[PDB]
Design a protein around this ligand. Structure first.
Ligand SMILES: COC(=O)N[C@H](C(=O)NN(CCC[C@@]1(Cc2ccccc2)C(=O)N([C@H]2c3ccccc3C[C@H]2O)C[C@H]1O)Cc1ccc(-c2ccccc2)cc1)C(C)(C)C
Lengths: 99, 99
């Protein structure tokens, strides 16, 4: 569908058996979620946005469902002030910017 | 046009007669640019990012071209790792998310 930008583009995703609200963010390279548990291996990483850097755990090959679309990708978990869905997953659902 | 997200959505903008590279970011409420000079008076603003909060200079009613599309709005100037075009201006150029 078409999502306007008059308001923040928030969507509900299903991950790790949990439902969470996240922001569709074309500016984010990868998806970043607040503290949560995920199975499998992970590696520490630092990501820097406005305000500085934060440390997160990188999990790969994580199943995620967005807008009824079942996709798989990388999820960064850490002290982010807000849940964000990044390009690494947006591409999988065929999301594009148009104007 | 239609922009896919396999790569960062970087585009050329024009402000103050100068061309600059900027990222179309649907996760940003506002537009923040790297240090530069703008006319008129500015107001203070505190914005929050993934790493914390930063102080920026707010300039209003500033002309700016994005991918050739004309806009006139609020621009924030502060310590950002990259120029980011936020929803305040994406709405002016008629940009939307589609999938
Ligand atoms: C309402 O505030 C905003 O819209 N803020 C924008 C912002 O950061 N938005 N992010 C969304 C945008 C965050 C961006 C910004 C960016 C873009 C280009 C170059 C460098 C950095 C970011 O931090 N990114 C990093 C990221 C992410 C994943 C993986 C790797 C990396 C490295 C960085 O590139 C990419 C973007 O997603 C979501 C958000 C929303 C509310 C609060 C809040 C939570 C509680 C209180 C107050 C605010 C905090 C964060 C500004 C750009 C305007 C600051």
């Amino acid at each position: 569908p078409q999502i306007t930008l008059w308001q923040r583009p928030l969507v509900t995703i299903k991950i790790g058996g949990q439902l969470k609200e996240a922001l569709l963010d074309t500016g984010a390279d990868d998806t970043v979620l607040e503290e949560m548990s995920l199975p499998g291996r992970w590696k520490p990483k630092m990501i820097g946005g406005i305000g500085g850097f934060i440390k997160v755990r990188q999990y790969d090959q994580i199943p995620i469902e967005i807008c009824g679309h079942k996709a798989i990708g990388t999820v960064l978990v850490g002290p982010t002030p807000t849940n964000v869905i990044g390009r690494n997953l947006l591409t999988q659902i065929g999301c594009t910017l148009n104007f």
